[PDB]
């Protein structure tokens, strides 16, 4: 009804991700009656749009065993699009792909220990030879070579984000092996799926921020000026910074983060200048989001603030808020856990004149949050998260994250007999049997707290 | 149950330290059925792991009079491993010891007064000649030469921390005699055994700090993010700083101390820069512990703080806390006796989101504390510490330390007839008879105080 901005919306090209029968990294499969509909011939380079900004460029081929409303893609493409099997993706015609002449690829450290020989010769040359492969910047692809398979990241391309790897292309692979930990931080960058119990608030954010930015026509046509300052407020640990991360990763807009304490940490004037820089940067990068996390740090009530520099910074901000003309296409978001400690002038019409209440999650909220927190956890057959959701009345998402963390530590405490701190590494078998039982959660629950 | 992380755990190589029959510094003895089990042949150079980070390298030989679950080692090796007889040690196969070509050894000043002659010629050369001795950097070893025995410290070695002293090795011994007081300060560096009444809290510290740092595989495998800010709190003199010292000396992690007043003593900006430096240093030295002692000095409630520089520092800290990415492998520890006077933003999720309560000790705690405080004290036959533990309900560790100090001063007061302040030194006999009686404790007890 109001949640309408979030509805899936059936389209010709919106397709469910199915497992590939064509196991090659550069290839996606569609049914023959689906290829006809989208006017995609055999062998055409296509653009795929996954979750959290992520894209892949692939060749499209027909498949009989594939369904009409499905798309067949292997683990590697699915990984690049940040999608599990049975997620919706956009398939888009992509005939504008120039042949690249310089690509920079790097291996991943843990997939490359022992005998270098020559990485390009053993792995990359047979992977690209006459293949005319489409690849995007930031693609992590796997290659097999005798003994084992090595993962590579596309660090740099010749045309801007994507190119066809012709026999012309110089494939540079000199450099530092990409640390596995970097790409784990990248896979586990926060998106809208990582934020739970905030469905109606997320709808609000897309309405107030995403919609006026990526569709300013609506507002101009309907004769209405889009709101330009959105303040997220709520109790400690409710998801504001998480939403800030999710928005940063999921928007079409250029995004600029300002941390409250980050600003206040810097020298007198050198902080006013960083604020100035942020607003000018956002203005410069046409459609933009400025997120001021912990706004209360930078904009407290000009009465209850003793320092002149501090009083000056509130004035510096207000000026910038009012400084953005209509045709700037910059929405400013901010987050606080003490909204009533922000100078009221900032909360007036034209400034942060819209509020999103990221409040305490209900029983259904808590369930969502526990499901998001355990998606990477090994859980036992007997673990009932609905039971946990129900036993946690006072809990915000931060409390639940901590709750899941403690139940896991308890599962570790149970496995302390076969583990010792003095050992160099932990026994192989011991690591696999690690499952967080319901009994672990009941311990975590017994120890649990609200921020009371 | 929860104390599980601390449990000794029986292992093939975990062995009880027994007095040596082979009196040589380079040699440890095991029983024949123990040598078979660990696949250690006669003469093999081994790696021994004691308490408080300490190691020793020795040659292993069979012994008949030695038990299976016991290891025979002399006073010197026991000293180097910082163990008294009947402590558990790790013995490790060590076939990777290259012959050293330069060692720097220095004598200890109090074992070297009068006639130098030549230290290398009289002591070192007969000690190492054709002996193929394993030695570690920091080893304090004793050598006998005619008139008396001299103590030597291994200051520097040729391969990194340990080498075999072949006839190739240049034995440098030029330089300042090592001060005895330095090596007393090193022997009496604080460890986990020096902290009593904190068993469950010590378990917590190893869980939250040692375990994630020296075994981050578990947390990744279980799909759980390790906590990254641990705050120890409790009343004045409970043993927070002591724990900080113990952790500093006992961890495998790099350890950076920050004292609160230390920081706030330094010029405006020059303190922000010192905080900066501490975090960059920890980040640089891969797996690290930052200890912020007396946090309340640097992070008070941004409201109840008048100084702009002081307000700026809290902001500088928060920034750094949030600034460490997941792949940093840096846990920040902090201590305070006023946890409620710290800015709550610091005590939020992701910051100091974990609390260790170093509280008042129970009866059994006080007994532990008194046993630690009197381990170097001359006590009378009639001194019953269980009696002292029970008479001290209000007392924390600092109170008990002072109680032991006052009991000792009372023993000195009883000996005031044969002592005079005007004398150049105290009579020899008078010094030896100095024993602290139970009557001394009852005087100390009578005068005693909590911090009420
Ligand atoms: N609604 C939620 N859904 C999923 N995870 C959540 C939610 N709320 C909190 N979490 C988890 O708790 C952590 C902390 O939440 P944050 O977004 O940092 O808190 P916050 O709302 O910014 O609170 P303040 O005001 O900074 S204390 C996140 O990293 C998530 O892992
Ligand atoms: N739990 C303990 N076990 C053994 N000795 C202790 C213990 N607590 C205190 N002590 C002794 O008392 C002295 C003072 O303790 P500290 O660790 O400095 O106190 P603290 O807990 O840091 O208190 P604050 O907050 O600085 S007043 C130490 O040097 C120890 O000798
Ligand atoms: Mg936040
Ligand atoms: Mg202290």
From Swiss-Prot, chains A, B:
Positions carrying N6,N6,N6-trimethyllysine: 304
Keywords of this entry: Acetylation, Amyotrophic lateral sclerosis, ATP-binding, Autophagy, Charcot-Marie-Tooth disease, Cytoplasm, Disease variant, DNA damage, DNA repair, Endoplasmic reticulum, Hydrolase, Isopeptide bond, Lipid-binding, Methylation, Neurodegeneration, Neuropathy, Nucleotide-binding, Nucleus, Phosphoprotein, Transport, Ubl conjugation, Ubl conjugation pathway
Impact noted for substituting residue 149 to T: In IBMPFD1; uncertain significance
Sequence position, cross-link Glycyl lysine isopeptide (Lys-Gly) (interchain with G-Cter in SUMO2): 7
Resulting phenotype, residue 115 to F: In IBMPFD1; uncertain significance
Keyword rRNA-binding set for record: no
Effect of residue 305 to A: Does not affect methylation by VCPKMT
The organism's place on the tree of life at top rank: Eukaryota
Localization annotation: Cytoplasm, Cytosol; Endoplasmic reticulum; Nucleus; Cytoplasm, Stress granule
Effect of residue 376 to H: In IBMPFD1; uncertain significance
EC number assigned by the record: 3.6.4.6
Record field: catalytic activity: ATP + H2O = ADP + phosphate + H(+)
Outcome following mutation: residue 120 to R: Severely reduced binding to DERL1
Function: Necessary for the fragmentation of Golgi stacks during mitosis and for their reassembly after mitosis. Involved in the formation of the transitional endoplasmic reticulum (tER). The transfer of membranes from the endoplasmic reticulum to the Golgi apparatus occurs via 50-70 nm transition vesicles which derive from part-rough, part-smooth transitional elements of the endoplasmic reticulum (tER). Vesicle budding from the tER is an ATP-dependent process.
Family: Belongs to the AAA ATPase family.
Domain remark text: The PIM (PUB-interaction motif) motif mediates interaction with the PUB domain of RNF31.
Subunit annotation: Homohexamer. Forms a ring-shaped particle of 12.5 nm diameter, that displays 6-fold radial symmetry. Part of a ternary complex containing STX5A, NSFL1C and VCP. NSFL1C forms a homotrimer that binds to one end of a VCP homohexamer. The complex binds to membranes enriched in phosphatidylethanolamine-containing lipids and promotes Golgi membrane fusion. Binds to a heterodimer of NPLOC4 and UFD1, binding to this heterodimer inhibits Golgi-membrane fusion. Interaction with VCIP135 leads to dissociation of the complex via ATP hydrolysis by VCP.
Name of protein: Transitional endoplasmic reticulum ATPase
Organism classification: Eukaryota, Metazoa, Chordata, Craniata, Vertebrata
Whole-protein residues included: 12 to 463 of 806
